Structures are given as C-alpha cells and as structure tokens.
Design goal:
It is classed as ligase. The entry lists the keywords E3, trim, trim67, SPRY domain, PRYSPRY domain, ligase. The assembly is monomeric. Crystal structure of B30.2 PRYSPRY domain of TRIM67. The protein is an all-beta fold. The protein has a single domain, classed as Sandwich (Jelly Rolls). Helices cover 0% and strands 46% of the residues. It contains no helices and 14 strands. The strands form two sheets. Strands 1, 2, 4, 9, 10, 11, 12 and 14 form an eight-stranded antiparallel sheet that branches. A hairpin with a 3-residue loop joins β6 and β7. The two termini are 16 Å apart.
Length: 164
C-alpha cells in the first residue's frame, strides 16, 4: 500500500482524495512520487485515468528519489517510464525512446506498472493487457513509484494489488 508523496512532488502537482489522486496546475509535465521505496520482491500497482483531455503524454513508471521533477518522466537518467497519449505509448529513459506501441489511454483507462526486482524487470499494462514487451531489464537498486502529468490529466492510484 502507498499513496502519492506530497513532499516528493513538484509544487504544481495537486493531490486529493487522501493523496490517492493527482493532477497538475501546469500545461508542462510535473513529477510526483509514491510513498514506497522498493528494493526487493515483485510489486504491481495501477493508475486509473480519471480525466484525459486534449492530447497530453502522461508518464508512468519508477524513479530514483533524485529524478528531475519539472520534466516528463524518463527525460533524465533517473526514471524509467512509459508515456502514453490517446493513440500510442513509448518507453523512455535518459531522453531515449524505445518500443513505440499502438494503443493508448483515455478517460476510464487503467495503467498497470509491474516492478519485478526478482527478475529485475519493469513491465507496463493498459486495461489489464501487457503494453509492449518487457520495457526495461537488468533494473537494479531502489525505486519509487513515479508519475508525470499536466493539467489535462488526473489519475487515481490503486495499490495493494496482487501481481498478475
């Protein structure tokens, strides 16, 4: 179980619903992290897309605590993310794009994030279906759940979820 960390986020992040819900005041992407740090075991969580207006690229994944908070997740070397619009996703890390996958998100979609620190992998799901191949492998160290979004998106966190 974790929530959004109100002390982790860019100041433009807006938390609500006992810190289970996030949006942003900015049209620029801003980061917020979860209250959990993972270093072992297998973790799965979901983000429900409460609101998706226009054509933004919210991003979902995991990060080091020192991730830059005022840019899309995966623009620096401290986050591993899937960014996704209404049409398609990309995987991003270190501002490098891999594995474009057709099929995106919309209001009512769910994004699932599977951080497997036994196998050292990060895998994404949309609406219960794996999105692309395993996104990143040989992932090591300590990760916090991460989100970036702007004012065109609102997401609600669902945690304490059984691994599929």
């Amino acid at each position: 179980w974790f929530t959004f960390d109100p002390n982790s986020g860019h100041r433009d992040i807006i938390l609500s619903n006992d810190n289970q819900t996030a949006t942003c005041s900015s049209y620029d992407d801003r980061v917020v992290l979860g209250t959990a740090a993972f270093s072992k075991g297998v973790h799965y969580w979901e983000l429900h897309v409460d609101r998706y207006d226009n054509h933004p690229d919210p991003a979902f994944g995991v990060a080091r605590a020192s991730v830059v908070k005022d840019m899309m997740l995966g623009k620096d070397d401290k986050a591993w993310a899937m960014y996704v619009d209404n049409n398609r996703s990309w995987f991003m890390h270190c501002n490098s794009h891999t594995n474009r996958t057709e099929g995106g998100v919309c209001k009512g979609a769910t994004v699932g994030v599977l951080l497997d620190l036994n196998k050292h992998t990060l895998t994404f799901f949309i609406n219960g279906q794996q999105q692309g191949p395993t996104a990143f492998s040989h992932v090591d160290g300590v990760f916090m759940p991460a989100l970036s979004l702007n004012r065109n998106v609102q997401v609600t966190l669902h945690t304490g979820l059984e691994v599929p």
